[PDB]
């Protein structure tokens, strides 16, 4: 059993990634009210805890951080604000967990659109790192593979 957590600001594609990993948009209908909604098997079972839609509820991310074991720090490349927001979340994990080091991954979602892009690759290099895309299936599985390794 493993528990992975998807963190980030709104409009970043957290939910799009989660569904695209566990099941897939369009190909099948997505029911988020059943036991296996966020569970997938890869040989180990993954439970994705996503803060999508609950961002205003600070207690919800904390509960997810406490139960988590791997963390996906997702941002968008169409929004300057979202990479700036990642500093706080990084530290907030290292306070609920009460540990010194936590296995995590940085994710730069929405790479498929370059004509609207305002952020660069440069910024996320130093703090793994992917320029994934949920809607274009780029690096979707990669995100959740790395966390199980770590």
């Amino acid at each position: 059993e493993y528990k992975l957590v998807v963190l980030g600001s709104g409009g970043v594609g957290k939910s799009a990634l989660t569904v695209q990993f566990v099941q897939g948009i369009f190909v099948e209908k997505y029911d988020p009210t059943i036991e296996d909604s966020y569970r997938k098997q890869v040989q180990c079972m993954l439970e994705i805890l996503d803060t999508a839609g609950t961002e205003q509820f600070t207690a919800m991310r904390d509960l997810y951080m406490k139960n988590g074991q791997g963390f996906a720090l997702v941002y968008s490349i169409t929004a300057q604000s979202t990479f700036n927001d990642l500093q706080d979340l990084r530290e907030q994990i290292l306070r609920v967990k009460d540990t010194d080091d936590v296995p995590m991954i940085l994710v730069g979602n929405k790479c498929d659109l370059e004509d609207e892009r305002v952020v660069g690759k440069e910024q996320g290099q130093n703090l793994a790192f992917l320029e994934s895309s949920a809607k274009s299936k780029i690096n979707v599985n990669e995100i959740f593979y790395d966390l199980v390794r770590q």
Binding site: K3, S15, A16, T18, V19, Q23, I25, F26, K29, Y30, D31, P32, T33, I34, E35, D36, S37, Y38, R39, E47, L49, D50, A52, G53, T54, Q56, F57, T58, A59, M60, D62, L63, Y64, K66, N67, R95, V96
Partner: protein, 627 residues
């Protein structure tokens, strides 16, 4: 052969049955069927012939008695108000809709040319042989464009379609019969609740008018008068369900109210002529903390960088653009203002001009600011946003755990009942897309955070350790009483407040707590286990009876993931499977409020909480209480 197929079912010989079956193997409409079903059809398929082009096979609005397969020739599919919608040719079949749904014919079938031959299966034989196997997926076409997809998942349900065709289908299949009075109020409910996503009132109201006045083009005078009357009765049912759904919210829609006032006059005038609508006209006459309306006005303070402010008078549903204009009015401006939300912790968000009803989307201690873009980074919070500096233990410690929980649940119920089912829809699909307020939902969702931070605030403002252990004991008790009243929302809010980093840190406080309450809390903390899609909570809430307040953040999550997980449009048609899913989740709230719920000093405290929502402040307070 034709004489053979004209013979009644119980008159055909074994050799007749064998020769027919061979021919059924050449019909593509029957190719998907099993050998068992096909030989049952050999003794059931009647041959029918008509010579004259323009002969009407059946009328729209008639009860369906037969399913047809075209051998020779072609037919027109005619729908009232549209005329010839499409043509069916050699090898095509029709008429299964009325038989499966037990509903009137959705269209008229008229001969296109001379000398047409049909294979027919009557009602009793269709239900026995074909009902479970024939036409499980039906995609209707109009002008060579796909217009509706029905699937047998027992009647057909709408999988996808155009807004117009979906409405047409839901009208046609309204059950008028008095014994079936709630079995229709549940089928229509999906459409009535969800239409605003794919067919707003600007389209729906004209469509309803056109449907109400649509006359039949087929049948004798009596037949036509009957078809039109039932059509009119069905439209009225829809309008009643639509008006009931919106309730007081119609005041925000001038088009919807103008329609309802004109519709009522039309029904009244028709009732004076036809002596009908006796049951439905008086019901239509009735329609023609309190919930906040979008048309209500607020006196809202918008602050400048120097911390002076302007009080603006605008509607609750006003856009950021209207807010900017109101500030620019009072201050006198042509200097490019932006509106920005700010937290107690200095965190800032620039609001788009597009954003509507932003006043209630603020954090507990958030304020609204107006400034040019270059002032953005220099903005600093108001002292008022930082919350209280002394506790209120002296006040609420003198109050009963049971009384606090009761007054909390009473107040939570007032707030929960103020929320409209449609506000959940607007919130999910995005406020700006509807220009409607979600103010009632926004304030009720905010209360979760208010209760959470109340706990953290009071614990962190309690300097005496012995009293702090008494606080933890009290909050645990208040949480337990909230769970008894089936107020699961406030229950989880208190437990999460206890789980806060600032509170959980206090080892000397937690250690000195009786093992009874340490046991209690451990059970509460396991109820919020996220494992297997919050299985622990979901089962707890499933056991409970109707009058209950659900864990709201999880409801919002379900709603978010239904929307992002599923597409609204498939193949350019409305994905009604998705619409149905959203509707079920919203009706979940209707189920929770279906039953009613069973000390002015205690009422006052609970409804006027003062809270620190600045996490950094609360941590600093905690770190000086127990280093």
């Amino acid at each position: 052969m034709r004489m053979i197929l004209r013979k009644p079912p119980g008159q055909r010989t074994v050799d007749d049955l064998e020769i027919i079956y061979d021919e059924l193997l050449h019909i593509k409409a029957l190719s998907h069927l099993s050998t068992t079903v096909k030989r049952e059809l050999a003794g059931v398929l009647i041959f029918e012939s008509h010579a004259k082009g323009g002969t009407v096979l059946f009328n729209q609005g008639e009860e369906g008695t037969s399913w047809y397969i075209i051998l020779k020739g072609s037919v027109n599919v005619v729908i009232y108000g549209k005329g010839v919608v499409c043509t069916l040719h050699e090898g095509d079949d029709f008429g299964q809709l009325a038989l499966v749904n037990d509903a009137p014919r959705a269209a008229s079938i008229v001969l296109r040319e001379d000398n047409c031959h049909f294979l027919r299966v009557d009602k009793e034989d269709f239900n026995r042989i074909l009902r479970d196997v024939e036409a499980n997926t039906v995609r209707l076409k109009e002008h060579d464009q796909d217009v509706l997809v029905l699937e047998k998942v027992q009647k057909y349900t709408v999988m996808s379609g155009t807004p117009e065709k979906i409405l047409e289908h839901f009208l046609e299949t309204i059950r008028l019969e008095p014994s079936l009075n709630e079995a229709t109020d549940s089928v229509l409910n999906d459409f009535v609740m969800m239409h605003c996503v794919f067919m707003p009132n600007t389209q729906l109201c004209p469509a309803l008018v056109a449907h109400y006045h649509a006359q039949p083009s087929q049948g004798t005078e009596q037949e036509r008068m009957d078809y039109a009357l039932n059509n009119k009765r069905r439209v009225i049912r829809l309008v009643l369900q639509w008006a009931a759904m919106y309730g007081d919210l119609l005041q925000e829609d001038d088009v919807a109210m103008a329609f309802l006032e004109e519709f009522y006059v039309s029904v009244s005038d028709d009732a004076r002529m036809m002596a009908a609508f006796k049951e439905q006209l008086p019901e239509l006459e009735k329609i023609v903390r309190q919930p906040i309306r979008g048309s209500d006005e607020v006196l809202f303070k918008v602050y400048c960088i120097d911390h002076t402010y302007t009080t603006i008078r605008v509607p609750v549903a006003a856009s950021v653009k209207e807010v900017i204009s109101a500030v620019a009015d009072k201050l006198g401006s042509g200097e490019g203002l932006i509106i920005v939300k700010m937290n107690s912790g200095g965190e800032k968000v620039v609001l788009k001009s597009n954003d509507v009803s932003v006043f209630t989307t603020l954090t507990i201690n958030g304020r609204l600011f107006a400034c040019p873009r270059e002032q953005f980074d220099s903005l600093t919070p108001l002292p008022e946003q930082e919350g209280p500096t002394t506790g209120t233990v002296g006040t609420f410690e003198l109050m009963s755990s049971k009384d606090l929980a009761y007054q909390m649940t009473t107040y939570d119920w007032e707030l929960f009942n103020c929320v409209h089912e449609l506000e959940l829809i607007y919130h999910t699909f995005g406020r700006h897309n509807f220009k409607k307020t979600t103010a009632n939902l926004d304030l009720f969702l905010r209360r979760f955070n208010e209760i959470q931070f109340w706990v953290v605030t009071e614990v962190c403002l309690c300097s005496q350790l012995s009293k702090r252990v008494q606080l933890l004991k009290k909050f645990i008790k208040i949480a337990a009483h909230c769970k008894e009243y089936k107020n699961l929302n406030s229950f989880f809010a208190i437990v999460m407040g206890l789980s806060n980093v600032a509170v959980s840190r206090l080892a000397l406080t937690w250690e000195k707590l009786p093992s009874k309450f340490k046991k209690f809390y451990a059970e509460f903390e396991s109820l919020m286990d996220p494992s297997r899609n919050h299985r622990a909570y979901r089962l707890t809430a499933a056991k409970l009876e109707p009058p209950l307040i659900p864990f709201m953040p999880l409801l919002i999550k379900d709603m978010t993931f239904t929307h992002e997980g599923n597409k609204t449009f498939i193949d350019n048609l409305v994905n009604f499977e998705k619409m149905r899913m959203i509707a079920n989740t919203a009706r979940t709230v209707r189920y929770y409020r279906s039953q009613p719920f069973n000390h002015q000093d205690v009422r006052s405290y609970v409804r006027q909480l003062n809270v620190i929502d600045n996490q950094r402040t609360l941590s600093q307070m905690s770190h000086r209480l127990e280093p």
